[PDB]
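User: For a benchmark we're assembling, each entry needs the component sequences followed by a predicted structure for the full assembly. Here are entry 17's components. Please fill in the structure.
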Amino acid sequence: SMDVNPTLLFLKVPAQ
Amino acid sequence: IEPFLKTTPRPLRLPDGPPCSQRSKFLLMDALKLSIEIPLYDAIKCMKTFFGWKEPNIVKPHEKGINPNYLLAWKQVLAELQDIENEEKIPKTKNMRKTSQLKWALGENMAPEKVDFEDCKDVSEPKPRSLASWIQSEFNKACELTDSSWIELDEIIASMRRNYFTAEVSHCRATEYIMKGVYINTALLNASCAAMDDFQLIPMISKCRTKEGRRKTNLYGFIIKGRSHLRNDTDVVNFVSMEFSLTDPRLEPHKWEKYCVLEIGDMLLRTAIGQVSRPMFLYVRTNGTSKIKMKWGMEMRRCLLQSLQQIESMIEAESSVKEKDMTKEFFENKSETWPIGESPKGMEEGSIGKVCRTLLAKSVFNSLYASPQLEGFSAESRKLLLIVQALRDNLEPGTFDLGGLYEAIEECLINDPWVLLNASWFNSFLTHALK
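Assistant: Structure for entry 17:
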């Protein structure tokens, strides 16, 4: 089952 | 623009050591509520919904504390709770007998009135801990939906967005954490101002609305306030927390290093296979806050805004590009096109719904695990994040002392379980970003 990792958002969302 | 600077970014290095331990103010995933439909009055009504109270016994001792003191503190709690039972007018909070156990736990022999020439102790390695799986479990459960609502639809155009987000988060365990923190911090503050010289008994309470709509009142356990004298805003009041849990401390003793854990009863639960008997534990530990920390805790609702705003802007990063407003598209179906997790299968994605909750959890854990280690890591890891993004798109960030940046980051990675998680997280991000 998925271990959530909010930093992965930055694979798509650009920092800032 | 000439990009040629590679897979230069390496994984961050995390500390070796004993595993990190829990250090939140109250329990999180291991919390247990006694519930029903004046705090102390409600506390007793909640406890009455439980019928497995037994003779308390230590099962996981605090390796540095005086354990029988913990056991006695609880027994004293029960005793004084009996005194209140029935009567006629049940008080708010209630002041407790300044007994030996309470004086000790509430750091009352460290009271300045006592000592001699030893009153001249002036000294001038904060000890590394390794990451443990528990903190990730903690966060996982924080992103989960609950069978209860923790907030009204407001704060009791793009206002539409508020509503969408609130729809997606009001049942989130993170949101419970927020409210749990608001109530007991408010409570702890009042008690701290209205007593000062009293050992107050504070029920840990929260409220919610069920699916079926019934209003529920939850009791998590008790907090005993110590002496709270001083108007210094950064000065600390010692307290001891007493929290119900079904969690056996012996599965991950490392998580519970700061705790004495009692077995305080046995519970009979309905189950896929029938009635099963499970021990009920009391997690006990000493601790302290300040007017400032209580203030910050009373304001955790801010996590909702911060959380929201990010989800908001995150829509501009798509709405301006797609020409049309995209809130409805996203919230009404698909674009499960943002990565948010790993699994045995690997990379994994989820919709704005999941995202809303994940960002809420993140904001909330930042607040629950606030620390200098964290201020540092954030400020510094943002930079590494920027850099990693550039390189990923084949861009030269420029002549920058990168190794210097690594030093800054890894020096924030000492023993905080939350910070270590974010570090581990970045490493994982780092692996996908520059595959």
